[PDB]
């Protein structure tokens, strides 16, 4: 009776608001983290205090690399994340692919580039593929009679990547791949009634002289969004209200994509 | 202190579902109709029964023509629709441009019914959306900022399947493509008044020989069926809600994945 | 023997350049104009000098207004009639004519009714009616007498997904024209009529700092295009080389659509 | 000198037709291949028989795997661009054609599919683009060519995904993101970056697939695609950048 969400990069910022919002709706929440161990553990205790046995935390590098104990592939670590929900609670109804690295990969003007490829592509595109695969296998290997009634996968994409940010080619490619995954997984998982949608923020919860300048670009309100302005949309899309939506991406950008230089 | 929604073509189908959903969230609803008087009036009696003074009905042909006098323009009729909300309740917070003509206009056939077809399919789908949006905008801009609503939201009912056009339906496909540009253009220009403008684009909703109903339905990837009206209108209500307040300029497909298909 | 093109708003700027490039490729050209009868008579003369009986001129208002009543749809069949009249054919239609002026929502009834018919007539309604006229003509040519390369190009706008503030009527009419392209492409494919769009950004563009400011924002070259930068694309899409391309819109915009405020 | 084009996967089919097309236009062509040595070398022979010194061949696995001396994909790709500069001193045009294509079903190792499908389609194209841009950047303004053009071969139909081809579809989506981001970033150096998206092309159970095509009810010939790649590289398309041109006979307009 209590559904389970797995939220990647759940420790802070938008991933934390997504986990908080799903939890508010009655979900048990698997809080994935990579480096933010203290934040993830504090968030868990907050939600477990509000509602016993309502949250767990699991650590994984979603980079496209191996990790030592066979060195452990990204694939294995992805199946293991999904397995953690099944092991704790016997289900996993919602997957939010939120975790994402983001930093410049300039084409113009070290082995960091292999590091960058692995990290940006892994977190943003390849781990989402492997997570959705493990998610879908687990639904597929549940007898029909016992399947949940509202399986939902949300990919966090980017409303502004048709208007790329100068110098972020690999990240922009990765988001594009992610949008690809949304359409391909919606089509292919439809027979198991698993919906696959994207949410794309424009500017959200910006870190002062420059904050002010970015803020002023947004037609609506001339500010970046709050975390909850994004997560409320994620929450709606996972709801039974949205049960006819799949294969689609929703921009939550204040009209930022409508602007031109 | 009760919010007001104007829903066009509210009498039946999707427009009635949207009207009932907004009503359920505590909107007073102004139900526009053209031909469907009996249905609209019964819808409004149901709503007023549930909550006094929470609905009215207004008639207007949104076809881009002049109507019965010196002659009345579509503009005027549109502005009068908005002014009906303001006359009765003193506000208009939401507008759902739902009303819409749909019928083939094939490029290859071979006369007054060519001129009234463009007027009807273009008016209902695009130009009346424009004028109602401009009349709606005018009212807000008119209100001292101290008396303005805090959640203004315009929704335009577009078509998920317009990039994959239905054979023979060119004017209709065009007018929907128009409606998408108004959605984007209005979102931009009305952002300073915090008027959000978005689209909702159904695929197959509330759909012939029945093996051809069963035939069309089966092509949708999710559930192999057309949607319920609620499956569409819940999305409309979400975009109107204060939880959607950073959303503007976007269209949301509700198509069960239909737009993902190829022949 | 010599293929015919019909080009609307052919008298100046981009439409003149399209008429020339088709003229240069050896089309006989029907130069449509509305107000600029001089410039058109001028151009006709020039190309009728390079080559006898290779250019004609034709006047019509493509606004959605009945004239002295003659409805828009008959003036459009008239235009198409005039190529078959003179030359016995019409192989190419370019819907280039377009009025363009602000129709703002805020700030500041005679005006408004005239803008609706002018902006939607010219950008959208007449193109519809012209295509209809053109398709019926081909349909009513026995197959064995049809030309081998029918091509319609609609001049759309690269930048309409990023609307120009205060231009809604225009932006809507361009989105109808996009609709027209895909819809006609699909419908006319059996006739082997190809229908495509070409979408300029800033082309052949207040205080000089303003002009420069606008030009400065184009990523590639930091300027507006020339007529020929656009007309070359049009002529390619009409060439037998593009014979597998229908239903598609080609941006010619120097990257401008890739920018954000 | 004559301008030079690098075409990846140039041995057969579209990639050969492109090579041929640019050659017939006056380009000297670097013909990249992976497994099709014999075909690549026959092409080059025909090409050099036509105009001496106008074709060469280079082999490279564009899968994202560290190869044997270990040699990474970055290195392989940079070297590929250096082969142009080494033999002809210039590289004017890059066509990212090379592409692996096979199912990666979500419902029925993965390691190799991922490195191969994302490398050929997405990660190699980026390193190739970056190598190209670095070689242009480092050329003194005075001696830079006057018509830099990069063509990504994308897919017109990827918004309408082929069931079971998730990784391929993702990789062509990455390649679309590369087209735009590289077009923006390399615009100041006057390198245009564009995509061409085939529908069904040169289908190798077939009349079923091609009858879905609105225009002519067939798949395209190889020329009906390469001619488009040729035009976009030409100076007549010098204002077109960031753009993808579908060449699909209208197939992307269909629905089930
Ligand atoms: N903020 C904005 O304005 C925008 C956001 N978005 C998208 O929304 C999503 C959420 O945004 P935001 O909150 O700003 O994200 P953040 O950049 O703050 O990061 C989210 C989390 O991702 C995790 N992560 C990063 N790299 C890896 C990796 N290699 N392996 C595993 N986990 C990793 C980190 O977890 P940990 O801290 O535990 O290491 C991090 O806290 C992202 O997908 C982003 O692309 C899109 C548009 C703009
Ligand atoms: N149903 C579907 O599968 C899809 C629907 N949509 C869109 O969703 C919306 C609602 O769809 P649906 O419920 O099927 O729409 P309907 O065709 O059922 O029409 C809704 C109402 O539009 C009104 N209307 C039509 N023309 C005019 C006009 N000239 N002037 C005034 N009102 C007019 C009618 O009111 P009356 O009866 O009072 O005369 C009608 O009941 C539309 O905008 C539609 O295009 C999009 C794609 C798919
Ligand atoms: N130039 C640019 O930057 C851009 C251009 N485009 C599109 O490219 C095309 C050409 O651009 P450009 O040359 O600058 O356009 P212009 O503004 O120069 O106009 C083209 C011609 O359209 C004709 N026209 C205008 N209104 C009417 C009408 N009501 N009835 C009949 N003919 C009419 C005029 O003919 P006459 O003079 O004979 O009256 C005019 O010369 C247009 O479709 C435009 O929308 C798109 C984006 C930007
Ligand atoms: N043909 C079609 O209908 C469609 C094609 N396209 C796109 O058009 C382009 C050309 O299509 P098409 O000619 O059919 O392509 P092919 O499937 O024939 O592949 C082209 C070449 O790619 C090379 N290649 C494949 N994998 C690798 C790799 N791991 N490393 C290096 N080279 C590799 C091969 O080289 P070698 O043979 O030497 O090993 C191959 O011959 C592709 O990018 C494709 O996605 C788009 C959609 C439809
Ligand atoms: C504000 O920081 C500063 O003061 C300066 C330091 C350098 N700097 C940036 O690194 C930067 C940071 C965030 C930016 N964001 C605007 C959205 C662009 O997509 C915020 C954003 C944040 N974190 C993010 N994390 C993921 N995984 N993905 C995303 N998109 C993301 N985005 C843009 C540029 C801007 C100026
Ligand atoms: C009297 O009708 C007949 O003779 C039949 C044969 C022809 N015929 C159609 O052409 C037809 C009807 C409805 C169709 N719908 C599919 C959605 C297309 O967008 C359902 C749909 C319904 N009503 C609709 N009303 C608006 N205002 N807009 C929409 N899109 C709409 N759509 C499609 C084709 C079915 C009915
Ligand atoms: C101080 O600031 C100013 O000077 C303002 C004065 C008013 N103003 C303009 O008049 C104006 C004029 C032409 C503009 N063009 C390109 C912008 C479109 O994104 C040039 C263009 C020309 N003529 C055109 N004619 C058709 N039929 N269609 C097209 N698209 C068209 N376009 C832009 C703005 C904007 C700014
Ligand atoms: C009778 O059953 C069989 O033998 C089937 C075996 C599996 N099978 C396919 O794998 C297949 C092959 C070619 C297909 N093409 C239509 C375009 C799909 O996007 C042609 C295409 C060709 N080669 C290609 N190579 C790259 N690198 N990329 C592309 N897209 C590509 N496409 C589609 C499916 C269908 C035939």
Decide: helix, strand or coil at residue B203.
coil
Structural Rg of chain C based on CA atoms: 18
CB contact under 8 A, B255 and A233: no
Closest-CA residue to C94 (of C191, C179, C176, C29): C29
Burial label, D139 (beta-carbon count in 10 A; 0-12, 13-18, 19+): middle
| Dihedral (Cα; C118, C119, C122, C125), 10-degree rounding | -100
Contacts of D48 (CB under 8 A, 6+ apart): D54, D55
Closest-CA residue to B20 (of B237, B259, B209): B237
What whole-number distance in Å separates Cα of residue A84 and Cα of residue A134?
11
* Inter-residue contact B246 to A229 (CB < 8 Å): yes
**Residue C161, token pair as written in the block:** 């997904």
HSE of B249, CA atoms in CB hemisphere, 13 A: 30
Residues written for chain A: 261
Mutate to test the pocket of ligand 7, among C100, C203, C215, C226 (most ligand atoms within 8 A of CB): C100
Atom of ligand 6 nearest to the CA of B207: 20
Q: Pairing between strand A94-97 and A55-59?
A: unpaired
CB contact under 8 A, A160 and C260: yes
What whole-number distance in Å separates Cα of residue B187 and Cα of residue A255?
7
Q: Measured between CB atoms, does B260 come within 8 Å of chain D?
A: yes
D159, D252, D255 ranked by CB distance to B161: nearest: D255
For helices D124-138 and A169-189, angle between their N-to-C axes, nearest 10 degrees: 160
Angle at D174 between CA A134 and CA B262, to 5 degrees: 75
User: Does ligand 3 lie within 6 Å of residue C63's CB atom?
Assistant: yes
What whole-number distance in Å separates Cα of residue C63 and Cα of residue C72?
7
Identify the closest residue of chain D to C259 by CA–CA distance: D184
* Inter-residue contact D28 to D239 (CB < 8 Å): no
Report the DSSP beta bridge partners of residue B7.
B31, B96
φ/ψ of residue A120, rounded to 5: -75, -45
* Inter-residue contact B54 to B28 (CB < 8 Å): yes
Contacts with C256 from chain A: Cβ below 8 Å: 260-261
What whole-number distance in Å separates Cα of residue C259 and Cα of residue A259?
8
What whole-number distance in Å separates Cα of residue C118 and Cα of residue B237?
36
What domains appear along chain C, each with residue ranges and CATH number? 4-259 (3.40.50.720)
* Inter-residue contact C216 to C222 (CB < 8 Å): yes
φ/ψ of residue B31, rounded to 5: -100, 110
Three state DSSP letters for chain C: CCCEEEECCCCCHHHHHHHHHHHHCCCEEEEEECCCHHHHHHHHHHHHHHCCCCEEEEECCCCCCCECCECHHHHHHHHHHHHHHHHCCCCEEEECCCCCCCCCCCCCCHHHHHHHHHHHHHHHHHHHHHHHHHHHHHHCCCHHHCCCCEEEEEECCCCCCCCCCCCHHHHHHHHHHHHHHHHHHHHHHHHCEEEEEEEECCECCCCHHHHHHHHCCCCCCCCCECHHHHHHHHHHHHCHHHCCCCCCEEEECCCHHHCCC
* Inter-residue contact D218 to D210 (CB < 8 Å): yes
Closest-CA residue to D122 (of D86, D175, D70, D169): D175
Atom of ligand 3 nearest to the CA of C155: 43
Closest-CA residue to C127 (of C83, C171, C183, C169): C183
What whole-number distance in Å separates Cα of residue A36 and Cα of residue B243?
28
Give break positions in chain C: residue before each, C–N beyond 2.5 Å.
68, 108, 205
Closest-CA residue to D180 (of C95, A173, A140, A230): A173
C161, C163, C261 ranked by CB distance to A261: nearest: C261
What whole-number distance in Å separates Cα of residue B74 and Cα of residue B61?
8
Contacts with B189 from chain C: Cβ below 8 Å: 104-106, 163, 165-166, 168
Contacts of B179 (CB under 8 A, 6+ apart): B97, B125, B126, B129, B156, B157, B158, B199, C172, C175
- Give, in order, the Cα–Cα distances in Å from D203 to each of A42, A158, D220, D230, D254: 57, 36, 8, 22, 19
**Residue C191, token pair as written in the block:** 């006739």
A256, A258, A260 ranked by CB distance to C259: nearest: A260
* Inter-residue contact D111 to A75 (CB < 8 Å): yes
What whole-number distance in Å separates Cα of residue B131 and Cα of residue B72?
14
φ/ψ of residue D88, rounded to 5: -130, 0
CB contact under 8 A, C120 and B115: no
> Resolution of the experimental model in angstroms, please?
2.1
* Inter-residue contact A121 to A113 (CB < 8 Å): no
What whole-number distance in Å separates Cα of residue A63 and Cα of residue A67?
10
CB contact under 8 A, B188 and A258: yes
Experimental technique, in short, is X-ray
Q: Which chains touch A (3 or more CB pairs under 8 A)?
A: B, C, D
What whole-number distance in Å separates Cα of residue A202 and Cα of residue A181?
20
* Inter-residue contact C254 to C218 (CB < 8 Å): yes
- Give, in order, the Cα–Cα distances in Å from A148 to each of A83, A88, A90, B41: 16, 16, 11, 41
**Residue A96, token pair as written in the block:** 């939010």
Q: Measured between CB atoms, does D248 come within 8 Å of chain C?
A: yes
* Inter-residue contact B136 to B82 (CB < 8 Å): yes
State the distance from the centre of ligand 6 to the C-alpha of C187, rounded, in angstroms. Answer: 17
Burial label, D208 (beta-carbon count in 10 A; 0-12, 13-18, 19+): exposed
What whole-number distance in Å separates Cα of residue B20 and Cα of residue A224?
33
Q: Pairing between strand B152-157 and D148-153?
A: unpaired
CA D101 to chain B, closest CA, distance in angstroms equals: 19
* Inter-residue contact A175 to D172 (CB < 8 Å): no
Q: Please count the other Cβ atoms lying within 10 Å of the Cβ belonging to residue C108.
A: 4
The arrangement of strands across the sheet holding A94-97 comes to: A55-59, A28-33, A4-7, A94-97, A151-156, A194-201, A249-252
Q: Measured between CB atoms, does C242 come within 8 Å of chain D?
A: yes
Q: Please count the other Cβ atoms lying within 10 Å of the Cβ belonging to residue B211.
A: 7
**Residue whose pair of structure tokens reads 């205790």 in the numeric block:** A45
For helices D73-88 and D124-138, angle between their N-to-C axes, nearest 10 degrees: 40
Closest-CA residue to D159 (of A200, B23, A180, C65): A180
* CA C28 from centroid of its chain's CA atoms: 17
**Residue D115, token pair as written in the block:** 């490195």
For helices C126-139 and B170-190, angle between their N-to-C axes, nearest 10 degrees: 160
- Residues of B identified as active-site: 172
Instruction: Mark which residues 56-95 of C lie under 8 Å from B by CB.
Output: 64, 71, 73
What whole-number distance in Å separates Cα of residue C163 and Cα of residue A139?
44
Provide the phi-psi class of B5: left if phi over 0, else alpha when psi is between -120 and 50, else beta: beta
What whole-number distance in Å separates Cα of residue B34 and Cα of residue B31?
10
Q: Pairing between strand D55-59 and C4-7?
A: unpaired
Evaluated on CA atoms A19, A20, A21, A27, the torsion sign reads positive
What whole-number distance in Å separates Cα of residue D252 and Cα of residue D235?
28
Contacts with B64 from chain C: Cβ below 8 Å: 116
Closest-CA residue to A189 (of A153, A225, A164, A160): A153
- Give, in order, the Cα–Cα distances in Å from A190 to each of B241, C152, D105, D138: 28, 39, 14, 51
- The active-site residue, picked from C128, C150, C167, C170, is C170
Give break positions in chain D: residue before each, C–N beyond 2.5 Å.
69, 108, 204
Give the max Cα distance, chain A: 59
Evaluated on CA atoms D34, D232, D241, D145, the torsion sign reads positive
CA D192 to chain C, closest CA, distance in angstroms equals: 8
CB contact under 8 A, B250 and A247: no
Closest-CA residue to C33 (of C70, C58, C4): C58
| Dihedral (Cα; B198, B204, B207, B210), 10-degree rounding | 180
Q: Please count the other Cβ atoms lying within 10 Å of the Cβ belonging to residue A6.
A: 29
Q: Please count the other Cβ atoms lying within 10 Å of the Cβ belonging to residue D210.
A: 17
Instruction: Mark which residues 99-128 of A lie under 8 Å from D by CB.
Output: 106-109, 113-114, 117, 121, 125-126
Evaluated on CA atoms C74, C78, C84, C90, the torsion sign reads negative
CB contact under 8 A, A172 and D177: yes
Q: Pairing between strand C4-7 and B251-254?
A: unpaired
Closest-CA residue to D4 (of D88, D79, D83): D88
């Amino acid at each position: 009776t209590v559904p389970v969400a797995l939220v990647t990069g759940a420790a802070k910022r938008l991933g934390r608001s997504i986990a908080e919002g799903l939890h508010a709706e009655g979900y048990a929440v698997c809080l994935h983290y990579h480096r933010s161990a203290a934040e993830a553990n504090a968030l868990s205790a907050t939600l477990n205090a509000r509602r016993p046995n309502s949250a767990i935390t699991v650590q994984a590098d979603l980079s496209n690399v191996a990790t030592a104990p066979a060195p452990v592939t990204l694939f294995t670590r992805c199946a293991e994340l999904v397995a953690a929900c099944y092991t704790h609670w016997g289900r996993c109804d919602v997957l939010v692919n939120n975790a994402s690295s983001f930093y410049p990969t300039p084409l113009l003007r070290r082995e960091a580039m292999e590091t960058a490829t692995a990290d940006l592509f892994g977190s943003n595109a390849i781990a989402p593929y492997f997570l959705i695969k493990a998610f879908a296998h687990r639904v597929a290997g549940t007898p029909a009679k016992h399947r949940g009634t509202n399986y939902s996968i949300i990919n966090m994409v980017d409303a502004m990547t048709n208007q790329p940010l100068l110098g972020y080619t690999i990240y922009t490619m990765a988001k594009g791949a992610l949008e690809g995954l949304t359409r391909s997984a919606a089509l292919e998982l439809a027979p198991l009634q698993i919906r696959v949608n994207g949410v794309g923020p424009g500017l959200s919860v910006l870190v002062p002289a420059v904050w002010e300048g970015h803020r002023s670009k947004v037609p609506l309100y001339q500010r970046d969004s709050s975390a909850a302005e994004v997560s409320d949309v994620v929450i709606f899309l996972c709801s039974s209200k949205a049960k006819y939506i799949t294969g689609t991406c929703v921009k939550v950008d204040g009209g930022y994509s409508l602007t031109r230089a």
